[PDB]
Amino acid sequence: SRRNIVGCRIQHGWKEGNGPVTQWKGTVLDQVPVNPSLYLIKYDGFDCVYGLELNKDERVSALEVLPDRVATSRISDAHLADTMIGKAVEHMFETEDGSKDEWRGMVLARAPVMNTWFYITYEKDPVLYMYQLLDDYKEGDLRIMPDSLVGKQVEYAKEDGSKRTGMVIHQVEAKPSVYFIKFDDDFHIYVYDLV
Numbered sequence: 001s002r003r004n005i006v007g008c009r010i011q012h013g014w015k016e017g018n019g020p021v022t023q024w025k026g027t028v029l030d031q032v033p034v035n036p037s038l039y040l041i042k043y044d045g046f047d048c049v050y051g052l053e054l055n056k057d058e059r060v061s062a063l064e065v066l067p068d069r070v071a072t073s074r075i076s077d078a079h080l081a082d083t084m085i086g087k088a089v090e091h092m093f094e095t096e097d098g099s100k101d102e103w104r105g106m107v108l109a110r111a112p113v114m115n116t117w118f119y120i121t122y123e124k125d126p127v128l129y130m131y132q133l134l135d136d137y138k139e140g141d142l143r144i145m146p147d148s149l150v151g152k153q154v155e156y157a158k159e160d161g162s163k164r165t166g167m168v169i170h171q172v173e174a175k176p177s178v179y180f181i182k183f184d185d186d187f188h189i190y191v192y193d194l195v
């Protein structure tokens with residue numbers, strides 16, 4: 001059947017609604033243990049982690065595994081990285097307009113495959129991002145703040161109106177009360193604290 005694409009680069013076509021087919025490239029970060037059809041992907045030029053069933057999803061076409069080898073790395077400062085994971089943070093960034101904005105978030109883990117990158121989520125957007133946080137730290141754009149469910153089906157009641165259903169796919173080791181959630185008809189990875 002299919003080979004193991006974790007750690008590999010890919011390209012594929014994508015068809016949204018009745019729009020045309022667009023072409024994408026990305027790096028496959030992980031294959032979800034509790035749903036091996038789901039892959040976590042970082043598409044080039046964007047810093048969120050997206051969940052796609054690359055082989056089932058009929059909006060995917062012309063899936064091709066690239067031959068690129070992602071340049072590996074050993075990181076710039078392990079202790080800073082270690083002590084940063086699991087911590088609340090303030091992340092400062094330049095908008096499209098050029099002005100500066102600052103978001104509150106939480107550093108989740110070291111990203112797979114891409115060693116100098118970190119899983120992080122935010123209060124204003126509780127999904128899974130990834131950034132080279134050690135550099136934003138040294139640039140002064142990041143500040144640290146003072147301090148079993150996997151596989152289960154779940155639904156999030158969001159008024160007004162309807163709800164979303166999905167699956168819990170990952171437990172964050174650094175904060176075991178936090179989980180990744182894949183919802184149906186949405187390709188972001190949601191990050192919630194399930195008390």
Ligand SMILES: O=C(c1ccc(C(=O)N2CCC(CCN3CCCC3)CC2)c(Nc2ccc(OCN3CCCC3)cc2)c1)N1CCC(CCN2CCCC2)CC1
Binds near residue numbers: 043046127187188
């Ligand atoms: O719609 C976008 C889009 C457009 C612009 C930006 C951006 O540059 N952006 C500029 C940089 C970024 C800033 C966020 N950071 C900056 C530092 C801290 C926070 C925001 C958007 C962006 N990036 C981005 C993403 C997701 C996110 O999470 C969703 N949030 C956004 C706000 C509300 C919901 C945030 C940003 C995404 N795409 C592009 C990727 C694509 C992958 C899924 N397909 C499906 C199959 C093949 C590929 C889906 C469609």
Ligand SMILES: [Cl-]
Binds near residue numbers: 102103104124
């Ligand atoms: Cl904020």
Ligand SMILES: [Mg+2]
Binds near residue numbers: 102103104
């Ligand atoms: Mg603030």
